[PDB]
Design an enzyme around this catalytic site. Structure first.
Site, PDB file in Angstrom:
ATOM      1  N   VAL A   1       4.846  25.551   3.252  1.00 43.00           N
ATOM      2  CA  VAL A   1       6.247  25.998   3.111  1.00 43.00           C
ATOM      3  C   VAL A   1       6.944  26.534   4.435  1.00 43.00           C
ATOM      4  CG1 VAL A   1       5.826  26.452   0.695  1.00 43.00           C
ATOM      5  CG2 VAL A   1       5.532  28.301   2.350  1.00 43.00           C
TER       6      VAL A   1
ATOM      7  N   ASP B   1       6.114  17.407  -2.478  1.00 49.23           N
ATOM      8  CA  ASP B   1       6.754  16.740  -1.350  1.00 49.23           C
ATOM      9  C   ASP B   1       6.487  17.537  -0.037  1.00 49.23           C
ATOM     10  OD1 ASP B   1       8.442  15.050   0.257  1.00 49.23           O
ATOM     11  OD2 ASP B   1      10.160  16.246  -0.284  1.00 49.23           O
TER      12      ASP B   1
ATOM     13  N   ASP C   1       3.688  13.200  -5.460  1.00 50.46           N
ATOM     14  CA  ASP C   1       4.501  12.443  -4.469  1.00 50.46           C
ATOM     15  C   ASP C   1       3.639  11.787  -3.384  1.00 50.46           C
ATOM     16  OD1 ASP C   1       6.944  11.371  -3.399  1.00 50.46           O
ATOM     17  OD2 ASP C   1       7.442  13.179  -2.267  1.00 50.46           O
TER      18      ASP C   1
END
Ligand SMILES: [Mg+2]
Ligand SMILES: [Mg+2]
Length: 678
Positions: free
Chosen positions: A678, A653, A471
């Site tokens: 995360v 992403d 991405d």
DNA sequence: TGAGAGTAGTAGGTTGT
DNA sequence: CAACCTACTACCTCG
């Protein structure tokens, strides 16, 4: 097949077949004076089309129209790149277009969509905003209302008939002064708009001052400034509100309350979900109605055959139902780890329950744990970094930061500061309290993924033993193209690679190959060999031959491959004809594309199926869909809800988002199994 | 900063030919 | 121009 069939509706509707007048549109040659450059020619035709009027679209190096020439503006001017071009349109008869051909099909679809917009503009009294129309009031209250309607599309099928897409959508409008809004015990809004134009203003402090006594630069007062421009004709002026320009940063401008109007977002409404049954109902209603307003005939809802993929069997140390369970049962793979605590609230040592839960966990996993506490505050400048380096030396692998909620800039600064010293961090926010179990359990899972433990893996048998997602992210006129991967037939290892700066969305061929190669080499380090086959996932569409080089290199290593464009939008909607809406639905379409509904729960509202295109490779669809679906379940940092995206793409992403936030310069010392983002 | 989809609101930016 | 990516903000939940 191995998997169980059912039938579904799409939010698409078949209308008339195209008659011949609609198949033989007027063609026009465009003459620009002076002639345009190569990059500007193509958009200028689009510009000539709107200026041309009627129902006209771009065609080739010319124009296509469903309006006869007599009602077009054939002579005119158009100012664009600071040059005024005179255009003349020359009509060249009608000419047949062929619907099986995707290029002419693209033009017929364009002409149809323009037709639709023009036919909607002459509707009354309904509210038109481009291809969305709003018909009835879904809600209302003292001074505000929510309109309801649908977003529409019209195109032409490969068999030469009209196609209608309908999806219910809502609009929030307010039409109330700031003064009156406050004058009914609403609180101040985030955003506000001029009553006299479109300019938005980020609102701020309502103020104690007086106008007709406040001084603007030029001898004039607020009151008489706005009065002069005559805006106090309809309205009456208010208290003295303060506004900050949206681009500008925290500069304050004065402004009457009587002349502002709140702009309302979802945050401000203390449904719009629409459980799927209701959405399906509404879709059919609106569709049939549109069919009626338009001379397109009777709408027929489109059906597709759908299959339910087997439910993936998630694993920790033993059988599991959610990643949060690994906390009780043990991880797929445990390693000797050390974790640190940083208290930024002025509190002391380890929260006890956290210590109990993790210790119990590492006990189940059979691995040894050592817990450290960091005694230093970042306000101590360089000594703080000294303490960090000392910690890393003592074997510490990741950091937990317990802090009151932080402003973004300060959050980023801290995270980054730890990162340069190789410390991924998990923020958890005080108060906390033990009975808020979900929050701190999710934070704990995050912490472990950031120290590189593999909390969960799969049990199925899959066609590709390496899966990689790609991405681009970042928002400063340039982006970061990055890749993340799941390694092993079990997905037993999760890794990221350093992104690369690029101009836009397109990832350079060599960059694609380099990120890919790093994942191959990673597989080599774990399994001691090259993968028999890899699954290549691109977020959004795959731009022309973007993978060509990587692809050829793979063919050269004797590695088989699959390329899948996974599109998060544009895949429309899927409703079952008679059953329950279930998770994991595979819906094949035309020859190389298909839908995949991966995540759903009833308290969320209607799902948004993914649309997938097999761009290259020879593995059967069903199996591709199977593996991707299972991969949505690998994500270790969400304890109670699987992500819509498969693990490699969700990671990718989040990776590019974080690198786009902090910078790429801190990562020089951070291990690639540690998921810092995360 | 718990994090997940699905919502609408704002403001961005980019690919195609 | 035209159609379609990214990034952020609530919310209610807890495969
Ligand atoms: Mg993204
Ligand atoms: Mg996070």
């Amino acid at each position: 097949n191995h998997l169980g069939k059912t039938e579904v509706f799409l939010n698409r509707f078949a209308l008339r077949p195209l008659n011949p007048e609609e198949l033989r549109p007027w063609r026009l040659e465009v003459v620009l004076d002076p002639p345009p450059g190569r990059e500007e020619v193509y958009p200028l035709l689009a510009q000539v089309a709107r200026r041309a009027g009627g129902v006209t679209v771009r065609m080739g190096d010319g124009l296509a129209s469903w309006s006869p020439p007599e009602v077009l503006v054939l002579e005119g001017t158009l100012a664009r790149m600071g040059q005024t071009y005179a255009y003349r349109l020359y009509p060249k008869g009608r000419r047949p277009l062929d619907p099986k051909d995707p290029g002419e099909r693209s033009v017929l679809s364009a002409l149809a969509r323009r037709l639709l917009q023009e036919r909607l503009r002459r509707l009354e009294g309904v509210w038109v905003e481009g291809l969305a129309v709003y018909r009835r009031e879904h809600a209302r209250g003292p001074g505000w209302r929510v309109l309801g309607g649908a977003v529409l599309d019209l195109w032409v099928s490969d068999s030469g008939a009209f196609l209608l897409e309908v999806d219910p959508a809502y609009r929030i409008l307010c039409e109330m002064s700031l003064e009156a809004w406050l004058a009914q015990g609403h609180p101040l809004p985030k955003r506000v708009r001029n009553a006299y134009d479109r300019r938005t203003w980020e609102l701020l402090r309502l103020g104690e001052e007086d106008p007709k006594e406040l001084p603007l630069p030029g001898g004039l007062s607020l009151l008489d400034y706005h009065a002069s421009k005559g805006r106090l004709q309809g309205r009456e002026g208010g208290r003295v509100a303060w506004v900050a320009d949206p681009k500008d940063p925290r500069k304050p401008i004065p402004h009457l309350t009587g002349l502002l109007v709140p702009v309302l977002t979802l945050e401000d409404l203390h449904a719009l979900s629409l459980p799927w049954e209701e959405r399906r109902r509404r879709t059919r209603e609106i569709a049939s109605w549109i069919g009626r307003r338009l001379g397109l005939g009777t709408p027929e809802a489109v059906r597709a055959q759908a299959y339910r993929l087997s439910i993936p069997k998630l694993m920790g140390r033993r059988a599991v139902s959610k990643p949060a369970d690994a906390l009780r049962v043990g991880f797929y793979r445990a390693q000797e780890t050390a974790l640190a605590l940083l208290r930024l609230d002025g509190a002391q040592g380890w929260p006890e329950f956290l210590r109990r839960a993790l210790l119990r966990a590492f006990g189940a996993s059979g691995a040894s744990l050592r817990l450290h506490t960091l005694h230093a505050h970042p306000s101590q400048g360089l000594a703080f970094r000294e303490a960090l380096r000392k910690a890393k030396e003592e074997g510490v692998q990741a950091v937990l930061v317990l802090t009151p909620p932080m402003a973004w800039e300060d959050r980023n600064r801290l995270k980054a500061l730890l990162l340069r010293e190789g410390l991924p961090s998990q923020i958890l926010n005080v108060p906390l309290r033990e009975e808020e179990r979900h929050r701190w359990e999710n934070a704990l899972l995050g912490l472990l993924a950031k120290a590189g433990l593999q909390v969960v893996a799969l049990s199925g048998a899959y066609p590709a033993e390496l899966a990689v997602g790609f991405d681009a992210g970042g928002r400063e006129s340039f982006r970061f193209g990055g890749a993340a991967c799941a390694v092993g037939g079990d997905g037993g290892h999760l890794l990221w690679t350093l992104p690369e700066a690029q101009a836009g969305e397109r990832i350079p061929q060599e960059v694609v190959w380099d990120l890919l190669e790093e994942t191959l080499w990673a597989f080599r380090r774990k399994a001691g060999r090259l993968p028999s086959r890899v699954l290549l996932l691109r977020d959004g569409r795959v731009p022309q031959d973007e993978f060509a080089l990587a692809l050829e290199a793979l063919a050269r290593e004797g590695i088989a491959y699959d390329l899948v464009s996974v599109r998060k939008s544009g895949g429309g909607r899927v409703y079952p004809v008679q059953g329950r809406l279930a998770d994991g639905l595979y819906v094949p379409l035309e020859d190389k594309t298909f839908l995949l509904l991966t995540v759903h729960r009833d308290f969320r509202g209607t799902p948004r199926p993914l649309k997938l295109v097999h761009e290259a490779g020879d593995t059967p669809l069903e199996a591709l869909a199977h593996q991707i679906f299972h991969l949505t379940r690998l994500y270790p940092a969400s304890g109670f809800a699987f992500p819509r995206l498969p693990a490699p793409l969700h990671l990718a992403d989040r990776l590019v988002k974080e690198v786009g936030r902090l910078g790429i310069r801190h990562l020089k010392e951070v291990d690639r199994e540690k998921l810092f983002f995360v």
